[PDB]
Amino acid sequence: KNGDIVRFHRLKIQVYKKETQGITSSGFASLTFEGTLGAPIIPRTSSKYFNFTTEDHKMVEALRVWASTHMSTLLKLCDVQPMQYFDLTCQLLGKAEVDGASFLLKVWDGTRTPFPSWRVLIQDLVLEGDLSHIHRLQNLTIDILVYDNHVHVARSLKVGSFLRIYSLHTKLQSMNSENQTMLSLEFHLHGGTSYGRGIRVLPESNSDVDQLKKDLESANLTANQHSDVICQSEPDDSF
């Protein structure tokens, strides 16, 4: 996320038309940390083994303080606006495609979209996913369509993980397939990374994922939602 704090060592600097820029050198090393004040400094790195120092962690804390009050967004699906963008974060319920410059991803947040989400005319056979955790809660699930470069990414994904869709497009819908009126919400991800359109798999150690888990704890126990699993002879608990 923006606001993460990064440390790059043996970073080799390069130039392009006087525009200086760093590159992952031979012999390079790195660290990275969470941006929140009021929480620990937990390392996030892939380089060699390292030794942290009080000066190093105090650089992290100082950068936290700085970003927070010297330099100086969260959005549930149920709080969106008819046509805009956002860096949404969800879990992937399934993935599919119809032959073309696009690829489907189905996700959920546990909150009700103001209008019902757009629903695709998908070739259902292409969809990967489990119906158990979906059907009788489908009203809390949505669809997203990614394009071009994002196709090979989305295609390579696996269902069940957690994602953050940076600069997800929202767009208003108002019609059905037979052109009867119906207000609805669309979601898209345009090709190319300009402006920052993209996706990154989120680790299930991330505190954002803990927040999303925390949220669903209420969305199910204190759900206040009508009945489901009318086939009460089905569970048998640990059969």
Partner 1 sequence: RCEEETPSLLWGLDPVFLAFAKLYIRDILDMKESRQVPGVFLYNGHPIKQVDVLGTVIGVRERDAFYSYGVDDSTGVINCICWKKLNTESVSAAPSAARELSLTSQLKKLQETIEQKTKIEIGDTIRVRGSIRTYREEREIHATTYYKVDDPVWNIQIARMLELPTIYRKVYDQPFHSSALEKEEALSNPGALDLPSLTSLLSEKAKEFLMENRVQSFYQQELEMVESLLSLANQPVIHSASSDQVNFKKDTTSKAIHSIFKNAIQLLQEKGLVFQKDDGFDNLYYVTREDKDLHRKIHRIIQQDCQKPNHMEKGCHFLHILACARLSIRPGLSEAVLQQVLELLEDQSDIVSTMEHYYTA
Partner 2 sequence: ASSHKGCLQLRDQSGSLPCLLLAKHSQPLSDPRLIGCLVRAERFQLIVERDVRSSFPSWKELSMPGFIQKQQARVYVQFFLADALILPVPRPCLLGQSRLFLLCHKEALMKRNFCVPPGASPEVPKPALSFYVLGSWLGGTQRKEGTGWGLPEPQGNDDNDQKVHLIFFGSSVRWFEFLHPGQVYRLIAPGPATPMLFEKDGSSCISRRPLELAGCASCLTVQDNWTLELESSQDIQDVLDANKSLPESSLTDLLSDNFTDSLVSFSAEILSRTLCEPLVASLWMKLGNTGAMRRCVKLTVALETAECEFPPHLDVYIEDPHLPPSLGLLPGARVHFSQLEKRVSRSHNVYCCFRSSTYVQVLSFPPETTISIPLPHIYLAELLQGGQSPFQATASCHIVSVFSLQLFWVCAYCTSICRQGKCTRLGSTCPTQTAISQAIIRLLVEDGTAEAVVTCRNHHVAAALGLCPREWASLLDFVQVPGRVVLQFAGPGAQLESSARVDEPMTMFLWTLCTSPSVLRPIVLSFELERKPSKIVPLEPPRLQRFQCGELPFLTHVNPRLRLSCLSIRESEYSS
Partner DNA sequence: TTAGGGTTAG
Which spans of this chain sit near partner 1 (rule: CB under 8 A)?
Answer: 78-79, 82, 112, 114-116, 139, 181-183, 226
Residue from 50, 120, 190, 206 in contact with DNA (CB under 7 A): 190
147 binds DNA, rule: CB under 7 A: yes
38-to-4, 41, 65, 68 alpha-carbon distances in Å: 15, 10, 11, 12
By beta-carbon proximity to partner 2, the closer residue of 121 and 221 is 221
- Position 57 contacts DNA (CB under 7 A): no
What is the distance, to the nearest Å, from the Cα of residue 93 to the centroid of all Cα atoms in its chain?
Answer: 12
Check binding of 123 to DNA (CB under 7 A). Answer: no
Separation of CA 193 from chain center: 15
Partner whose binding site includes residue 179, from DNA, partner 2, partner 1, none (CB under 5 to 8 Å by kind): none
Alpha-carbon distance of 213 to 90, in angstroms, equals: 11
**How far is Cα 188 from Cα 143, in angstroms, rounded to an integer?**
9
CB atoms within 10 A of CB 152: 10
Task: Compute the least distance from the CB of residue 112 to partner 1, in Å.
Answer: 7
The least distance separating partner 1 from the CB of residue 177, rounded to whole angstroms, comes to: 15
Q: How far apart are the first and last CA of the chain?
A: 43
Stretch near DNA under the rule CB under 7 A, chosen from 115-123, 142-150, 201-209, 220-228 = 142-150
The minimum distance between CB 239 and partner 2, in angstroms, equals: 7
- CA 185/CA 116 separation, integer angstroms: 6
Which one, 5 or 140, has the nearer CB to DNA?
A: 5
Write down the residue that tokens 């999303």 correspond to.
212
Q: Rounding to the nearest 10 degrees, give the CA dihedral for residues 227, 232, 235, 239.
A: 160
d(CA 101, CA 148): 6
Residue 239 interacts with DNA (CB under 7 A)? no
Tokens of 170: 């929202």
Would you count residue 203 as binding DNA (CB under 7 A)? no
Residue closer to partner 2 (CB basis): 122 or 216: 216
148 binds DNA (CB under 7 A): yes
The nearer residue to partner 1, 101 or 230, going by C-beta atoms, is 230
At 221, phi and psi to the nearest 5?
-65, -60
Alpha-carbon span 139 to 223, nearest angstrom: 13
Q: Is 99 a residue that touches DNA (CB under 7 A)? A: no
| Contact call for residue 130 and DNA (CB under 7 A) | no
Residues within window 214-233 making contact with DNA, judged by CB under 7 A: none
Q: What residue ranges bind DNA (CB under 7 A)? A: 14, 16, 19, 21, 85, 101-102, 145, 147-148, 167, 169, 171, 188, 190-197
